[PDB]
């Protein structure tokens, strides 16, 4: 069975300001599907990437 | 209880140090080594021979066994220094065929420009890359570690987690990968120009570059770019350390119509000479060395010389108008 | 290739992430004259024409 | 699937080759030997049944040993000697004395037991038969000829009378009688012995030095049939080459001074640079006898093989001495 796939951008600030700046892998985002059930539904990262 | 006890260790080094030296040995006339590379032993082993799985007999080294060798022997060839190279086991970069192709551990040596999926950049030879650091995730050879830097700080192999994106590139004298971002870092060496890539090169083992056919150019091998602060250097293959010489020589029937002629058994065994010398009439004449590239085994003189390396094999069979080719390599 | 850009971004950088491009890189250049009596004695200057 | 082996003599061979590429100045290989590393493994490396940490290979570890190295001594080829086992006929101390198998090599006249002939250097005889009462490798066989015959080896049970004699082809005492028999070599001259020969060692000619006397080396004698020959360090398949190397306080006094903990680990190197003030200035390679590790350029010349000891203190007027022995 194959999963969700969809592709965000996310407009982020790093903290430390430190220019060169990534996302890892399998970061965690809740994801509210048209309804079948409230519950979001888990979108992780499917590899790391950087900004 | 012991009182001394001391450890000490040979650099691999020393190893090329030997093959760069035992290049230098052979000689053209004079006062350095000749090389001639001998067949024989049209008769069978054994009726097995023929079948699968038949291993012939051990070779055996004794006054006795030369004379054995050197009963049979079918046809000798000389060999030129020129047909004689360092080398290095082949890796490119991306290729499908050998594992991991994307995916280099430390200190591994990278052929571009090899192939098409290898190949960057247009116009341009073999080039050679070594990895100098990989992408910190990976494994350790040592079980006891998960950190690669944890690993090394041990010196323990690492392997990396994460594949090369791309196959190292640039001149340039650090220059893998290094700022926008990547986990290996990659080290550049020389280019290798075309035709020697396609004469000598087999997709196993480069052909690494003499410090002396250095001397004459360091362009055609890309290296004159470099930086070495040692003035002129050419000693590369100190930083490849290669340890393999290539022997490479050519069999034709033509010069042992006998021994290739229809219904040879072929010849089981190999053997190679060092510095024969040629048959006389008169034992008393003075001794001389082999200049031609092959000789009937009468034309030589009986045991003249040594033979360092004897070799059996199944029946292998010459023929006519066939060109039958040799490699044999060296690890010193 | 890769990246779709569409209607997207107002970031110049990571668009620079990779425009495509090309980087740095050394050469040498020539041989060298004493201005008078050694060469160590002389000293360098490119600006870059 | 075939079989293959390589000779013996190639061992030699390769030493023949090595032994003809240490050059003097030009083109060819120069040595040089470096100790080092004042500085204390641990506070234990004194004690006894101490081993230094196992040597690395890296340029780091180069670095790092090319950073203490004390002092740099260069080889002369008239330093290097090829060496086979010593063993001597008749000497009590060591076991069967008077037992010998095939093939075996004998020093003879090395000493006053040993000494059959006066006013004649060493000899080296090589026994070719041994006695045909024995013991085989092989337990299964008590047949010195057919243990042989198989391969295995012997242990021939009956002694030898005397040690053997007689420039003459196999001798053997094979006439008269005895279970040995006897082929000749060559002989040693007394001053090279005396100087050379360590008891465990005896030194082989050079084929070179050989081409000069076959006689001071009692070659002469002997049958070639190939006129010159002298490739005889073939026959003794000398694999194992002898460096010898003079230390001396006086060219480092500065580790020499009272107090010293000495050098803790040994290395050679192979063609370094003289030190150069200006980098652009044309490399040089080195002469003379001791270079303080600073005359040296950094780095210059290859050291092939490194090694690491509990401390050895020098000492002024102290005068040390080290050889190392290669096998191929």
Not at chain 2, 120 to 134: F, Q
Not at chain 2, 167 to 173: F, L
Not at chain 3, 13 to 42: A, L, M, P, T, W
């Amino acid at each position: 069975k194959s999963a969700a796939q969809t592709e965000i951008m996310l407009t982020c600030t790093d903290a430390l300001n430190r220019n060169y700046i990534t996302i890892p892998r399998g970061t965690r985002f809740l994801a509210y599907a048209k309804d079948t059930s409230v519950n979001p539904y888990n979108f992780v990262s499917r590899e790391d990437v950087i900004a | 209880d012991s009182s001394v006890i001391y450890r000490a260790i040979v650099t691999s080094k020393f190893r090329t140090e030997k093959m760069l030296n035992f290049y230098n040995s052979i000689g053209s006339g004079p006062d350095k080594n000749t090389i001639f590379i001998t067949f024989g032993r049209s008769e069978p082993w054994s009726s097995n021979e023929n079948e699968v799985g038949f291993a012939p007999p051990y070779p055996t080294d004794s006054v006795l066994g030369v004379t054995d060798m050197w009963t049979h022997m079918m046809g000798t060839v000389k060999v030129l220094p020129s047909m004689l190279d360092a080398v290095i086991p082949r890796r490119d970069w991306g290729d499908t065929r050998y594992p991991d192709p994307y995916t280099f551990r430390i200190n591994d040596i990278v052929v571009c420009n090899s192939a098409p999926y290898n190949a960057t950049e247009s116009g341009a030879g073999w080039l050679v890359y070594r990895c100098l650091d990989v992408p910190d995730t990976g494994m350790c050879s040592i079980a006891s570690l998960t950190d690669k830097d944890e690993c090394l700080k041990l010196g323990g192999k690492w392997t990396p987690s994460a594949r090369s994106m791309t196959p190292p590139e640039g001149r340039g004298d650090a220059e893998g990968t290094i700022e926008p971002g990547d986990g290996y870092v990659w080290e550049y060496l020389f280019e290798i120009p075309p035709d020697v890539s396609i004469n000598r090169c087999t997709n196993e083992y480069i052909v690494v570059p003499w410090p002396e056919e250095l001397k004459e150019d360091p362009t055609r091998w890309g290296y004159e770019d470099n930086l070495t602060w040692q003035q002129d250097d050419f000693g590369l293959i100190y930083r490849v350390k290669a340890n393999t010489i290539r022997f490479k020589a050519y069999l034709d029937s033509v010069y042992f119509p006998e021994a290739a002629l229809p219904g040879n058994k072929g010849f089981r065994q190999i053997s190679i000479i060092t510095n024969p010398l040629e048959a006389k009439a008169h034992p008393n004449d003075p001794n001389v060395k082999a200049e031609k590239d092959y000789y009937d085994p009468e034309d030589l003189m009986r045991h003249s010389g040594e033979m360092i390396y004897m070799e059996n094999r199944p029946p292998i069979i010459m023929a006519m108008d066939q060109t039958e080719e040799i490699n044999i390599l060296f690890t010193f | 290739e890769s990246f779709q850009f569409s209607p997207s971004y107002v970031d110049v950088s990571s668009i620079s992430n990779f425009i495509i491009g090309e980087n740095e890189y050394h050469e040498i250049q020539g041989s060298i004259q004493q201005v008078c009596k050694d060469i160590n004695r002389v000293y360098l200057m490119e600006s870059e024409g």
